[PDB]
From Swiss-Prot:
Site description Major binding site for inhibitory zinc or copper, residues in chain: H80
EC number: 3.4.21.117
Primary localization: secreted
Tissues/organs with expression: Expressed in skin and, at lower levels, in lung, kidney, brain, heart and spleen. In skin, expressed in high suprabasal keratinocytes and in the luminal parts of hair follicles. Not detected in liver and skeletal muscle.
Activity-regulation annotation: Inhibited by Zn2+ and Cu2+ at low micromolar concentrations. Inhibited by SERPINA12.
Pfam families in UniProt: Trypsin
Location relative to the cell: Secreted
Name this protein carries in UniProt: Kallikrein-7
PROSITE patterns xref list: TRYPSIN_DOM, TRYPSIN_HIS, TRYPSIN_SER
Similarity-based family: Belongs to the peptidase S1 family. Kallikrein subfamily.
Disulfide bond sites: C7-C136, C26-C42, C108-C210, C115-C182, C147-C161, C172-C197
Species this chain originates from: Mus musculus (Mouse)
Length: 224
């Protein structure tokens, strides 16, 4: 997160770290005691999932192994459409003041809606500086029409843009897969942006989660 702030204690109990061994690979967001949502590009054979702490590589946090990933079959490595994935935990996480599932969206929030995105990505770019503390950036939803002015044909139908005009506040390396929450629901998952990060008027791009409610439910479904 470029030009963010340290997220308030307990305000993001759905944030997880997806670790490659001990090292940060991606963000992710708890959606059930057994299930984490994140970006398809974040996929690995196995993860260590850190839950219930604002501090990356927290020795006290619960780490739960995960080895089963369910990428949206429509994910493109070329265009990065459908950049969404569910990851099943080996064991269920215990809920607490630090651990809690996010509310999945019923509807798509409109442009201009106030949001917050979080992660342990670098706070500087191109030179990198990885924080201990979970960082937060307040951004607003940008219409497709407006975003297309910047990214043209790179933008697909289920990518969602967000940022603040003439601000650097934004996502960056290592924030991939993390939550964009607006109005108490998850509206986006960090997918991409321009490099170097934090260029004013280069929105962040997120997978638009309200467009995947059916796939998300079908994949987690636990009943007839
Ligand atoms: C789908 N998309 C095209 N691929 C990526 C690449 N990506 C993965 C990544 O960089 N992971 C990662 C995870 C942890 C550490 C580092 C890293 C970077 N530099 N070093 C030394 C380590 C990198 C990312 O994390 C990118 C982060 C990003 C964002 Cl989210 C917005 C604007 C610019 C950037 Cl560069 C997003 N997109």
């Amino acid at each position: 997160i470029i030009d963010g702030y340290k997220c308030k204690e307990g305000s993001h109990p759905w944030q997880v770290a997806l670790l490659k061994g001990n090292q940060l690979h991606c963000g992710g967001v708890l959606v059930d005691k057994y299930w984490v949502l994140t970006a398809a590009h974040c996929k690995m054979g196995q993860y260590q999932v850190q839950l219930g702490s604002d501090k990356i590589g927290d020795q006290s946090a619960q780490k739960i192994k995960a080895t089963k990933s369910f990428r949206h079959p429509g994910y493109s490595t070329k265009t990065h459409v459908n950049d969404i994935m569910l990851v099943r935990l080996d064991e269920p996480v215990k809920m607490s003041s630090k651990v809690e599932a996010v509310q999945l969206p019923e509807h798509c929030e409109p442009p201009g809606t106030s949001c917050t995105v979080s992660g342990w990505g670098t706070t500087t770019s191109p030179d990198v500086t990885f924080p201990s503390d979970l960082m937060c950036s307040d951004v607003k939803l940008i219409s497709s029409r407006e975003c297309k002015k910047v990214y043209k044909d790179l933008l697909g139908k289920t990518m969602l843009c967000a940022g603040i005009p003439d601000s650097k506040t934004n996502t960056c390396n290592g924030d991939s897969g993390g939550p964009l929450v607006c109005n108490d629901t998850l509206q986006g998952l960090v997918s991409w942006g321009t490099y170097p990060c934090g260029q004013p008027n280069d929105p962040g791009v997120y997978t638009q989660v309200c467009k995947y409610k059916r796939w998300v439910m079908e994949t987690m479904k636990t009943h007839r």
